[PDB]
Amino acid sequence: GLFGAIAGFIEGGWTGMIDGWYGYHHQNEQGSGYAADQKSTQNAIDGITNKVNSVIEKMNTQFTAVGKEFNNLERRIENLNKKVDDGFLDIWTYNAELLVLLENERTLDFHDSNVRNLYEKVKSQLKNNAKEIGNGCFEFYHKCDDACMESVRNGTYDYPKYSEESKLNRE
Amino acid sequence: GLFGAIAGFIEGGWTGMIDGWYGYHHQNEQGSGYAADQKSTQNAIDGITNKVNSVIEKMNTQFTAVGKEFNNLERRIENLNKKVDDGFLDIWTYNAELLVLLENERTLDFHDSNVRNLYEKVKSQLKNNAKEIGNGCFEFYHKCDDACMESVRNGTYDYPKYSEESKLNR
Amino acid sequence: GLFGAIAGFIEGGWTGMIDGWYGYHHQNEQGSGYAADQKSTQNAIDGITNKVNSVIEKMNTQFTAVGKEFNNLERRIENLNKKVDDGFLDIWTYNAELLVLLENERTLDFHDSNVRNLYEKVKSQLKNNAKEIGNGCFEFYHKCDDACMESVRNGTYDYPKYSEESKLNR
Amino acid sequence: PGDTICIGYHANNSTDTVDTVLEKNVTVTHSVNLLEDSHNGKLCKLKGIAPLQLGKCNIAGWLLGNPECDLLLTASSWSYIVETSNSENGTCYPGDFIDYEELREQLSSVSSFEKFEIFPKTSSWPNHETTKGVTAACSYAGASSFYRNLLWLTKKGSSYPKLSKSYVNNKGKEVLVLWGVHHPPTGTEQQSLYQNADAYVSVGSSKYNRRFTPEIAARPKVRGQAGRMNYYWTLLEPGDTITFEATGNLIAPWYAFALNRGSGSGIITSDAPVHDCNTKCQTPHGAINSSLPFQNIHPVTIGECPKYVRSTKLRMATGLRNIPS
Amino acid sequence: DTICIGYHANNSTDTVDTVLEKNVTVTHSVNLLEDSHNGKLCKLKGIAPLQLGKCNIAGWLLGNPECDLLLTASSWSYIVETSNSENGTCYPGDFIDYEELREQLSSVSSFEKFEIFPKTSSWPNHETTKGVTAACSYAGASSFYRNLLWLTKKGSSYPKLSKSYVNNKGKEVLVLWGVHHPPTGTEQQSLYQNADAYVSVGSSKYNRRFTPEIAARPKVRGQAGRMNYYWTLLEPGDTITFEATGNLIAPWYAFALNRGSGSGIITSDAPVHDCNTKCQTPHGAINSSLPFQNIHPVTIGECPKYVRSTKLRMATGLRNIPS
Amino acid sequence: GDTICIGYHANNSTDTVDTVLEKNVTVTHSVNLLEDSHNGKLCKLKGIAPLQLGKCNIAGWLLGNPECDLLLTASSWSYIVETSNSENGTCYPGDFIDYEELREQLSSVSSFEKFEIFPKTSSWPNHETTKGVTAACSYAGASSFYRNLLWLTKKGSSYPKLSKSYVNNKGKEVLVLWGVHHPPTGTEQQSLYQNADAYVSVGSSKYNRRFTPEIAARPKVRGQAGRMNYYWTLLEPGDTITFEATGNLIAPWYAFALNRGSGSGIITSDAPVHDCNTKCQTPHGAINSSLPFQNIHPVTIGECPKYVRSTKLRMATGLRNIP
Ligand SMILES: *[C@@H]1O[C@H](CO)[C@@H](O[C@@H]2O[C@H](CO)[C@@H](O[C@@H]3O[C@H](CO[C@H]4O[C@H](CO)[C@@H](O)[C@H](O)[C@@H]4O)[C@@H](O)[C@H](O[C@H]4O[C@H](CO)[C@@H](O)[C@H](O)[C@@H]4O)[C@@H]3O)[C@H](O)[C@H]2NC(C)=O)[C@H](O)[C@H]1NC(C)=O
Numbered sequence A: 001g002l003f004g005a006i007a008g009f010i011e012g013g014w015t016g017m018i019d020g021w022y023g024y025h026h027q028n029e030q031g032s033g034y035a036a037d038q039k040s041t042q043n044a045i046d047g048i049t050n051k052v053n054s055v056i057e058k059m060n061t062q063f064t065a066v067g068k069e070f071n072n073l074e075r076r077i078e079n080l081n082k083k084v085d086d087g088f089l090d091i092w093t094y095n096a097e098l099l100v101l102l103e104n105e106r107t108l109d110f111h112d113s114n115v116r117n118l119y120e121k122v123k124s125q126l127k128n129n130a131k132e133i134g135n136g137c138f139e140f141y142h143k144c145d146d147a148c149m150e151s152v153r154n155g156t157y158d159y160p161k162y163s164e165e166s167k168l169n170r171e
Numbered sequence B, C: 001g002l003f004g005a006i007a008g009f010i011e012g013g014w015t016g017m018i019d020g021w022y023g024y025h026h027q028n029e030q031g032s033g034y035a036a037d038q039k040s041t042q043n044a045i046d047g048i049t050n051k052v053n054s055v056i057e058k059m060n061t062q063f064t065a066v067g068k069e070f071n072n073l074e075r076r077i078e079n080l081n082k083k084v085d086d087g088f089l090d091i092w093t094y095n096a097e098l099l100v101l102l103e104n105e106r107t108l109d110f111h112d113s114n115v116r117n118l119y120e121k122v123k124s125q126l127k128n129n130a131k132e133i134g135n136g137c138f139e140f141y142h143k144c145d146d147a148c149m150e151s152v153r154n155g156t157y158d159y160p161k162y163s164e165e166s167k168l169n170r
Numbered sequence D: 001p002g003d004t005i006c007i008g009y010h011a012n013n014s015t016d017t018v019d020t021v022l023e024k025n026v027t028v029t030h031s032v033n034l035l036e037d038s039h040n041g042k043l044c045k046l047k048g049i050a051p052l053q054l055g056k057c058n059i060a061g062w063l064l065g066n067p068e069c070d071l072l073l074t075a076s077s078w079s080y081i082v083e084t085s086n087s088e089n090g091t092c093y094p095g096d097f098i099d100y101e102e103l104r105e106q107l108s109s110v111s112s113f114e115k116f117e118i119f120p121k122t123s124s125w126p127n128h129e130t131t132k133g134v135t136a137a138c139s140y141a142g143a144s145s146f147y148r149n150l151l152w153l154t155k156k157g158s159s160y161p162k163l164s165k166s167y168v169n170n171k172g173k174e175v176l177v178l179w180g181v182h183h184p185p186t187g188t189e190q191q192s193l194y195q196n197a198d199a200y201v202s203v204g205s206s207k208y209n210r211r212f213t214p215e216i217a218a219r220p221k222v223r224g225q226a227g228r229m230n231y232y233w234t235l236l237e238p239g240d241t242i243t244f245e246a247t248g249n250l251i252a253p254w255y256a257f258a259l260n261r262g263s264g265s266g267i268i269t270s271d272a273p274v275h276d277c278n279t280k281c282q283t284p285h286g287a288i289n290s291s292l293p294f295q296n297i298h299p300v301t302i303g304e305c306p307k308y309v310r311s312t313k314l315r316m317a318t319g320l321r322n323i324p325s
Numbered sequence E: 001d002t003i004c005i006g007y008h009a010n011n012s013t014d015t016v017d018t019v020l021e022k023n024v025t026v027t028h029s030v031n032l033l034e035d036s037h038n039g040k041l042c043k044l045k046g047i048a049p050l051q052l053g054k055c056n057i058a059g060w061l062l063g064n065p066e067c068d069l070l071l072t073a074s075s076w077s078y079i080v081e082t083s084n085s086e087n088g089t090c091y092p093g094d095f096i097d098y099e100e101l102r103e104q105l106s107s108v109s110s111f112e113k114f115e116i117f118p119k120t121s122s123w124p125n126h127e128t129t130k131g132v133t134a135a136c137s138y139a140g141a142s143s144f145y146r147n148l149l150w151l152t153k154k155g156s157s158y159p160k161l162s163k164s165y166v167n168n169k170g171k172e173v174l175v176l177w178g179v180h181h182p183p184t185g186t187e188q189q190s191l192y193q194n195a196d197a198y199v200s201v202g203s204s205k206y207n208r209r210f211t212p213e214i215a216a217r218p219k220v221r222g223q224a225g226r227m228n229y230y231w232t233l234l235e236p237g238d239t240i241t242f243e244a245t246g247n248l249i250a251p252w253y254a255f256a257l258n259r260g261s262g263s264g265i266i267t268s269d270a271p272v273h274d275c276n277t278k279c280q281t282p283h284g285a286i287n288s289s290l291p292f293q294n295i296h297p298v299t300i301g302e303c304p305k306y307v308r309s310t311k312l313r314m315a316t317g318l319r320n321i322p323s
Numbered sequence F: 001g002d003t004i005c006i007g008y009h010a011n012n013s014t015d016t017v018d019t020v021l022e023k024n025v026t027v028t029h030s031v032n033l034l035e036d037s038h039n040g041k042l043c044k045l046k047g048i049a050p051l052q053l054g055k056c057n058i059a060g061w062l063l064g065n066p067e068c069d070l071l072l073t074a075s076s077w078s079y080i081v082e083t084s085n086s087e088n089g090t091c092y093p094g095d096f097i098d099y100e101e102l103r104e105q106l107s108s109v110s111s112f113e114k115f116e117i118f119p120k121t122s123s124w125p126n127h128e129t130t131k132g133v134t135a136a137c138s139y140a141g142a143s144s145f146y147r148n149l150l151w152l153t154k155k156g157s158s159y160p161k162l163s164k165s166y167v168n169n170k171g172k173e174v175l176v177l178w179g180v181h182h183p184p185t186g187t188e189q190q191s192l193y194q195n196a197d198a199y200v201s202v203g204s205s206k207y208n209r210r211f212t213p214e215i216a217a218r219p220k221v222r223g224q225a226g227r228m229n230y231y232w233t234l235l236e237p238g239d240t241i242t243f244e245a246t247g248n249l250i251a252p253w254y255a256f257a258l259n260r261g262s263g264s265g266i267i268t269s270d271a272p273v274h275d276c277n278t279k280c281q282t283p284h285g286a287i288n289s290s291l292p293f294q295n296i297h298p299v300t301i302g303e304c305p306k307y308v309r310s311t312k313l314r315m316a317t318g319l320r321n322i323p
């Protein structure tokens, strides 16, 4: 994908994370588990809901449309009528198909972007208090219990608080 | 949102920077200041100017278009004429609105991309002569007077020159 | 460009690299050379091939279409026929031109992204066994013979293997 | 051996696929279908009102009152009109129904009518013969007959005096008036039926005005008849008067129709069965119940329907690429 | 010491819609949708429109006596009917191919009216002074159309007339005439003498024959008779010939036509003013270089494309985040 | 120091494309989607040559204007070609009723079998068959007439009533054409047809008309003050058409048994016909292309790329070219 994360440096998805689109898996002395990132997930849901609704909104409904009849001396206007109906049908079929193609691409890339930005967000919080493995994972140079983990997840991780412990273990 | 910079790892914009779309804030002994980035801004301007002219260029002006009349035994061709006018109008309304929506998304992402690229550009100049904060700021490991700053802005920063001083302080 | 690699932090392209869209240039003690990256180039070729075919496939061909004749008392329907033909012609000229403009933007950026992602893949393979120059180049801290180079190109570079040598020199 | 946190994304057991510009058949975790392809195979009510089933009749047979179409004599309101592939009873006496396609177009915005006796048979025509106008071309139940809504006038004794007969529209709405003009095959039959070799029919209202003169030509038998009848109609506005004057050849109005206009109706051709269900959207194949923007069931629709496209699939990705591996 | 990267913000309140979110505030933007006009009817190429007022096209070209202000009209940029354009055919009947004539007129930018058959000298054997009716009154007196002449019997005889006009104008000539249909045979006799009357009109291309259709019709403007109106465009060099033994409403004036493009007939109740425009709608003129407009689908000149949109604003700057 | 660099391809391409943000971008690879080349010739489709009408138009062909004799043998075609000089149609002045509808009908005919519906030498024993010629239809220095119709006149001093039927036993639709003559004077009426008050009637299962001559002097066209109207009908298999007349009938002589086919049409072109083959034909020339669009001509016969007004549609496939 365009942003290199989904099917990228983060090789696969997690069937064990059932309550959101993006999120975290942690392991510490207390245990292991998945947790969805609510902020990034909800931002994506809102965006995508708006995209679908905007697509539908531009498609005003079809009201009663029934065929016209023409007598045997009205072949030119009958054919004009058919050219009009066929031409509009060609255009609307084209617009619907193309719009779905292009938007599908954009949507997958939007997800790939959201994963990449979540990864980079965590990376910049942790800095050198953790080492990047490369597969979306970080190994802490300090003990990180459940409260600490939740601080990473909600974006309030305290780098200076854990820097000295980290520096001792990093060297 | 796509590129993570605008409303992202750089949380907010600068009302203090009025001479361009993207730029630098610097702070040293000799003073602090805002300075737009001429090159990035100008390339964004040429791009967007082109985008707008291209949108406009595809749209044929409308020449004289007036109604037709039909008698009470021409209701089929009256209804055909109406089907034609309404159908073309639905299509042009659709095309106009959709082109604006999609292009607006693209324009905002373009600006996001420009900010991000400017950031990484600076980061590649400086390397280890500074540390990243996480909010679009770098702290230098040496004294960077307004001459040095200027060098950083216009892409002529000399790394080796300060590499030793920085290594030391670092 | 959107992803900052092409005409970006990698100034320009390689006329020397003839066998692919993206790849590598190396120099070691054994000699220099260019080599295309099979995986990257191929994925790009499949994608672009599919994009071109999709565009073409959405444009169903034009079958027999000829003028109609109208007598001197059929000006209204003659004008209606003209409005219909011109109208459909406006729409299709617009759709063709606009689709090519937008997709061309996307294709160029797709390539730019492919280069960025390739450079990042190599970067995370090498870690601190090489220094980033910044122009798309990495300088190793250890001896990297043709087999080592090939492992970098095919994604199976053994970092631990050379970590100790590299630390020493680093 | 330290604590770890990983960043990742959702996978599930979804098998939904979407197409994209660069790649076909991409499996995604979530998606929404925008293309309705299901219908119930029935013709339903709209606004709780049933369609009018013409059955073996067509619109000409209904309005003129072809004697085979007697089951329709009671029809008065409908949501749309249904013709079938066996709608063949129309003009049983051969000739041209003038501006028939225009009449069909008008009827598409009619939702009901009240039939009434515009010129009662027994009292309107004291100087002309009203009982001999039947034909084997319009046979019913073993006997020669004729349209129920028109009256074939012929000469009484050896004279057809000029008739003049007017109707004032006091119905408060448009009245559809139909009549016919008979065209014998010979000058001899013209004389035997109508006496006057030089006959005409004139019809005028405030806005309508037309003169019809028999076009007598040798021609082949259709349904046994070398004669022809042309059928005509006009819409008489509220408060206006229609006047028929003739010295032969008039097939007079007998019953006419006060019309109620209503939007979003029309005529469809379908062999699907009518049922006692209700719908918002009807096609000739069956009714649609759907909030989707597009459908590929039929270009002909009545009511409020999704837009017809030729597509066989339109599925938007909403979730991400599905990689459970 | 520190250096930071950043992006512009201002006090912009401009918003645009995007596919992922609505109402995003941006630092700069441009409106592509014209929604303003000047509420007047203006000139094009500095030429004024022809205002028909209480008349319609039929009343103008026939010269309905209520339309005498138009008698002097000769050139226009477009033609304007109003909601009160009711004076057309004052003697009831059908104006044959009226909608077609209107379509023709839409590409006529001027004409020279001329006396095709001068009333005083064209008809020495017919009565030219009695063809008036209360259906077409003027000043409380029976009158008739100014551009047609209702010929009747002189004494007790309507001899066969034959009159031709050769088109020496170097351009098309629009010729109008009528055929009258009395309600009774005694009225046919009073007016025209001949029961078996006909009217025949022929040119190189036109060829029709008309006979009286006598019948009682409902009265319209007091009249149980009807008059049908006809027209043809006579090409340069061609001749038109009328022959009649009754019932001819003869051409008196005709119109030599100048073709021009970009003209048309609109319906509007907006006032005409001395201003000038490149783009006119029935609501008012537009002065704009924007690609779209939502003012009206009907346009004369060079106009933005009509769309049903209420907002088409394109972002040019970035998301505005002044905090 | 030991090194690896990541890079991308450049070459000598000078191909340029337009993008939204930038015009004339040089790229390493690209594909043109727009066909702008044709061979300048009118070619065969499905191995079948078009019918070249040449100096004739469709009326001249179907009636058999004497200048159109080269077409007398034509029976099948892939499409029909008129030229800028297709002037020979109706040589005796008059109206061809529903002529445009006939052209449209012929647009879906791929061949026919012409046949003598009413042989000239045996069909009309009581009428004169050899005098129906006119200087308006002169050919090779002599007065003549249409090859496919027959102008019947009186035999001595008598034109008795004629009645003639044809039953369609061809197993497909038959196109039948005829005329009705309207003389300028009673003198010419009697001279040609004897009977002062004549008629022509035509009836089938679907057609029914009695025509009465309209005698009036019109402006001369091609030397004639008279007019001839031309009529046509399509007779269904098994149906009968019956003509009766006491004068004024321009009788069918040859008719056409029609074979319907799709994808045919009439085009106007001055390009030369050649023995080449194509799947797509325009009035400028043939197109051989698998591209999606063409800017050659909106009129096409066959299977063609979609017409657009563009001068350039080039899609980038490779990347920006920076050597
Ligand atoms: C130029 O155009 C104007 C506007 O259209 C014409 O003026 C109208 O003329 C018509 C026809 O005469 C008038 O309609 C008639 O009205 C009579 C009475 O109308 C009442 O209402 C008006 C206005 O409110 C009052 O002034 C009046 O005193 C009445 O209270 C009716 O008696 C008539 O009906 C009878 O004849 C018609 C057929 O025409 C039948 O259908 C009816 O059943 C009935 O027998 C008639 O409807 C109308 O009032 C005038 N309007 C105005 C605003 O002036 C000019 O005549 C026209 N001039 C020319 C030369 O073209």
Ligand SMILES: *[C@@H]1O[C@H](CO)[C@@H](O[C@@H]2O[C@H](CO)[C@@H](O[C@@H]3O[C@H](CO)[C@@H](O)[C@H](O[C@H]4O[C@H](CO)[C@@H](O)[C@H](O)[C@@H]4O)[C@@H]3O)[C@H](O)[C@H]2NC(C)=O)[C@H](O)[C@H]1NC(C)=O
Binding pocket: E237, F065, F066, F067, F087, F088, F089, F090, F091, F136, F137, F138, F139, F220, F221, F222, F223
């Ligand atoms: C086949 O088509 C060709 C080409 O169209 C056609 O030849 C043309 O015939 C006409 C004969 O009418 C010629 O035009 C005439 O030229 C003379 C001499 O200058 C004029 O006097 C004529 O005008 C008089 O008659 C007109 C009415 O018909 C009047 O309107 C006018 O006022 C005059 O009284 C007339 O314009 C033309 O020159 C030729 N051209 C060529 C190339 O020969 C030919 O007759 C057609 N043949 C058939 C059988 O269809």
Ligand SMILES: *[C@@H]1O[C@H](CO)[C@@H](O[C@@H]2O[C@H](CO)[C@@H](O[C@@H]3O[C@H](CO)[C@@H](O)[C@H](O)[C@@H]3O)[C@H](O)[C@H]2NC(C)=O)[C@H](O)[C@H]1NC(C)=O
Binding pocket: D066, D067, D068, D088, D089, D090, D091, D092, D137, D138, D139, D223
């Ligand atoms: C109501 O509609 C039905 C169905 O179309 C009509 O019945 C059909 O009538 C036609 C004409 O009479 C019949 O065709 C004829 O058959 C005879 C041989 O029997 C043949 O000699 C004729 O040339 C022609 O082919 C047809 O068979 C008949 N079909 C059926 C199903 O009975 C009916 O007449 C209509 N009635 C009215 C009053 O409109």
Ligand SMILES: *[C@@H]1O[C@H](CO)[C@@H](O)[C@H](O)[C@H]1NC(C)=O
Binding pocket: A146, A147, A148, A150, A151, A152, A154, A155, A156
């Ligand atoms: C984030 O996590 C910390 C540490 O566990 C917690 O105390 C704090 O309240 C959280 N903040 C938010 C955003 O709720």
Ligand SMILES: *[C@@H]1O[C@H](CO)[C@@H](O)[C@H](O)[C@H]1NC(C)=O
Binding pocket: D013, D014
């Ligand atoms: C997929 O998941 C749903 C519930 O989430 C379950 O009902 C269904 O059986 C599952 N299908 C598979 C592939 O097992």
Ligand SMILES: *[C@@H]1O[C@H](CO)[C@@H](O)[C@H](O)[C@H]1NC(C)=O
Binding pocket: E011, E012, E013
């Ligand atoms: C923003 O600034 C301008 C001057 O630069 C001022 O006139 C205006 O009042 C301000 N607008 C808003 C919306 O605050």
Ligand SMILES: *[C@@H]1O[C@H](CO)[C@@H](O)[C@H](O)[C@H]1NC(C)=O
Binding pocket: E276, E277, E287, E288
């Ligand atoms: C239209 O506007 C432009 C610029 O806004 C101005 O120069 C021109 O004078 C205006 N024209 C009219 C006719 O109002």
Ligand SMILES: *[C@@H]1O[C@H](CO)[C@@H](O)[C@H](O)[C@H]1NC(C)=O
Binding pocket: F012, F013
């Ligand atoms: C461009 O390069 C290719 C490959 O070396 C060569 O075949 C071709 O002749 C060159 N064309 C030009 C115009 O230099």
